[PDB]
Amino acid sequence: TSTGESADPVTATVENYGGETQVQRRQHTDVSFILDRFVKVTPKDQINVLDLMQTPAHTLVGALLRTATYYFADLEVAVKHEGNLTWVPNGAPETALDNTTNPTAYHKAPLTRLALPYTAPHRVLATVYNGNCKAARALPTSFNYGAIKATRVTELLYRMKRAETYCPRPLLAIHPSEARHKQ
Amino acid sequence: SGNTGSIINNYYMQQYQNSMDTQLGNDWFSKLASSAFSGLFGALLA
Amino acid sequence: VLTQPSSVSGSLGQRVSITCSGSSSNVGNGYVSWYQLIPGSAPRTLIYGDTNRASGVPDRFSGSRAGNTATLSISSLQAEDEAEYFCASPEDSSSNANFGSGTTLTVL
Amino acid sequence: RILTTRNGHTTSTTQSSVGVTYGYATAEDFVSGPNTSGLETRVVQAERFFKTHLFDWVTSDPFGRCYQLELPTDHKGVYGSLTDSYAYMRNGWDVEVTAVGNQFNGGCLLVAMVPELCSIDKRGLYQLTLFPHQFINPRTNMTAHITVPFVGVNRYDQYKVHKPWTLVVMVVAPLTVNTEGAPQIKVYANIAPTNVHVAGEFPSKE
Amino acid sequence: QVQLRESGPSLVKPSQTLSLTCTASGLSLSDKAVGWVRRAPTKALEWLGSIDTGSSTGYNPGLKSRLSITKDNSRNQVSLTITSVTTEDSATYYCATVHQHTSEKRTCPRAYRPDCAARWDCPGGADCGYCNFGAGSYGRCTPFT
Amino acid sequence: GIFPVACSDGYGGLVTTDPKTADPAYGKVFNPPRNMLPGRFTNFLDVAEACPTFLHFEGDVPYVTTKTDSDRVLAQFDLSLAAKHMSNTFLAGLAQYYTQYSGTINLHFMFTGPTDAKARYMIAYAPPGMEPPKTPEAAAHCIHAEWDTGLNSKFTFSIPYLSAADYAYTASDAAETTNVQGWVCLFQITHGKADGDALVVLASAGKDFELRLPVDART
């Protein structure tokens, strides 16, 4: 069979050989739905830029998002801060924070949640960038959803809603020394 | 849609809830798979 | 490189000024001093630090600094003012302090 | 199954071919939005192929080595001028790789049109085939005719700082010569822009 | 008022080991370094090297082949050597005293600030972060001088 | 019988943007008829379009002189809303609070010189990437408009908006690496017997210039 070598998807699906195909109901694999889990991200004290790809690669989101170059995530943060945190939209100046005229939230225990409209001015944000010489590099300072200033931010979190991703890029798994990797 | 399906919708309006969207004037990796060639490329005996 | 005048005039009791044109490589990162270099005699401190002076020195001739060019004023011109007034800067292009040839300070 | 492509005034026929593949889309998306105020002007004299030289596939080239090329490759003639005249240009690419073979050599060289790569760590290489690709086995087709429409974070881009498409060639199977096969075939790319657009004009050089 | 004094040979033949000396018996050249310059005849100003008290020399490379200098602290006299002299080299000995020392470091290039890094997990030698997270200028935390 | 409910943690906090409305201390209070106000303005952009504002050129005046020399550049300023040549205008004084703007920016030139003399000015736009031009016929290739000044004087070039992203940034560092929004020009190819006459410019929001993302920063 096959021999097309045209890289156009070909799959027998166990029909080849007298076997019926019990139905495959793929859920827990929509990028609209597997990409909506609060992922703890290392807070950077008082002023940590709030943006995608800050999260370590290993976390579920932090890795199943690098699978896609461009995402449109309508982010919604959840923070656990010690003074009144003051969000700020994209393009706001560094001294922009502490004005309070910006969206802030006073302290309500245990923690305070927010929605963050997609402010960054692009069609869609990009996970990787080219022509610039890694999350801390090879990408424009503009792909972010503001800055979340605080007296102390203890456990920052990012949740993505209605994110449809584009143009997939390869993932990777933990390379085991021996086969049948035991965990 | 995503991980949020509620019968009572949302107390706030759509504009304040999510970003709004625009248009001008479909997906590709769920049509590439659906357009995959299947079966056998030659006459099958037995 | 520094550039400093070599032809100045003046009379007794009236002020003449000296100008020390420099570049970013040398003028910025350090002091601007002036000394009494009587031709054929030794020089001694008269202004160094652009703000402060030592003990036992007269303040008759005021020096200053502003921008990238140094300037001093020669108040109450006298006959002991008949000597060269050198200047310098730290020329960081070779991590050394470029000095200046002093001007013939005549008295009329 | 010969396939005679054509762009502008530059026909490029093949005697062996496998068939055109496509990437991420078949028809390019809309061209004018709020990004440029119709200050867009199409271009129809800048879609002619231009050759280029990638590398020299040789029997000592182990798996993994990939010589990647980044478009537009600073063209000298047409599409070299569109480059220094207009600040923003958007195009979709038509790229065909032609590794000459004696038909007795099998290397399974693979091409891809991966958008915006940086540092595959030799773990993503095994999965590189995810992007559009046709891999050429000299047991079969001596060419591979990809095509991709311009994908980017903006309507239009500046091709001085943000080069979206990089051609990638990977040797899956080191070349294997026997007296019957070329001791080492070279690989060359007919990279050809298509559906160009420009907007805004630089001032002259003087 | 620090004391300074110069002495040297006044009647000299060119193209020899010319060795002037100078004296500084005060603090203006005890913590700070010795001066050696002269004025070009009917020309623009001159330069000759200097040394700090730690024997750290620095000269102009154009004539480095002919310049070398050493220093002393007890007699309050400092050495000098000008070899391979040509007729064009002649002036008066002046400005034995050096009034400066150097410093080169600069930071916060453009709109960046070094202290505001580790906000973007900055990776590499560059330690200067981008201060206002708005339009891109150098991207994120490109290294300064 | 008691209705059950679970109070979410962090669901409710006093966010300083108030989508929710308050509790009323006084149930009933009547204020005098505020209608038919002399002149009302719905949004600031309508006010910005309705009245043109001046720009601040060198020497702290709104007018650009008529230079008489081999140099033909009069005022060549960055297009970002915070440049020195707009620091004065109402449009800048507004966009300073918002962050992202889009669309045209109407520049109004009007010649105020005596009818004794007339001279031609040629605005020119130049998109980013290459250093701004230096002389007429150098910036000619770049989109530009020339105009004499005869019967009537006010001419209104409309600086277009074409940028990589769909929205540009209102506030960005302008110290070094120019700004990326773009350059503009007021090149004067000719001028006959008219040094006294002096140009005055006026900025305004164009047919569409609808800014977003309010952030009350320091001002």
Residue numbers in the entry:
A (entry chain 1): 2 to 134, 154 to 203
B (entry chain 4): 15 to 39, 65 to 85
C (entry chain L): 5 to 112
D (entry chain 2): 13 to 218
E (entry chain H): 1 to 145
F (entry chain 3): 1 to 219
Q: Mind quoting what the paper says about this structure?
A:
By contrast, R50 scFv binds to a depression between the 2- and 5-fold axes of FMDV-OTi and FMDV-AWH. R50 binds FMDV-OTi VP1 and VP3 by its heavy chain. The antibody-interacting residues on the FMDV-OTi capsid are located in the VP1 BC-loop (residues OTi-VP1V50 and OTi-VP1D52), VP1 EF-loop (residues OTi-VP1P94 and OTi-VP1E95), VP1 GH-loop (residues OTi-VP1R157, OTi-VP1L159 and OTi-VP1P160) and VP3 GH-loop (residues OTi-VP3D173 and OTi-VP3T177). The interacting residues in R50 are located in HCDR3, including residues R50-VHR119, R50-VHW120, R50-VHY130, R50-VHN132, R50-VHY138, R50-VHG139, R50-VHR140, R50-VHC141 and R50-VHT142. The side chain of R50-VHR140 extends into a deep cavity and forms interactions with OTi-VP1D52 in the VP1 BC-loop and OTi-VP1L159 in the VP1 GH-loop. In addition, the small protruding structure formed by OTi-VP1P94 and OTi-VP1E95 of the VP1 EF-loop makes contact with R50-VHR119, R50-VHC131 and R50-VHN132. One salt bridge between OTi-VP1E95 and R50-VHR119 was inferred because the centroids of the oppositely charged functional groups of the residues were within a 4 Å cutoff and because the Glu carbonyl oxygen atom was within 4 Å from the nitrogen atom of the Arg side chain. Moreover, the side chains of OTi-VP3D173 and OTi-VP3T177 form hydrogen bonds with the side chains of R50-VHY130 and R50-VHY138, respectively. Particularly, the mutation OTi-VP1E95A completely escaped antibody-mediated neutralization (VN titer > 250 μg/ml). Notably, the R50 footprint on the FMDV capsid does not overlap with identified receptor binding sites, indicating that R50 may not directly compete with the binding of receptor.
Foot-and-mouth disease virus (FMDV), a small nonenveloped single-stranded positive-sense RNA virus (genus Aphthovirus within the family Picornaviridae), is the causative agent of foot-and-mouth disease (FMD). As the major antigen, the virus capsid of FMDV comprises 60 copies each of four virus-encoded proteins, VP1, VP2, VP3 and VP4; VP1 to VP3 form most of the capsid shell, with VP4 lining the interior surface. In the current study, we isolated a NAb (R50) that neutralizes FMDV serotypes O and A. We determined the cryo-EM structures of FMDV serotype O (O/Tibet/99) in complex with B77 and F145 scFv, as well as R50 scFv in complex with FMDV serotype O (O/Tibet/99) and with serotype A (A/WH/CHA/09). The final resolution of the cryo-EM reconstruction was estimated by the FSC 0.143 cutoff to be 3.90 Å for the FMDV-OTi-B77 complex, 3.68 Å for the FMDV-OTi-F145 complex, 3.94 Å for the FMDV-OTi-R50 complex and 3.49 Å for the FMDV-AWH-R50 complex.
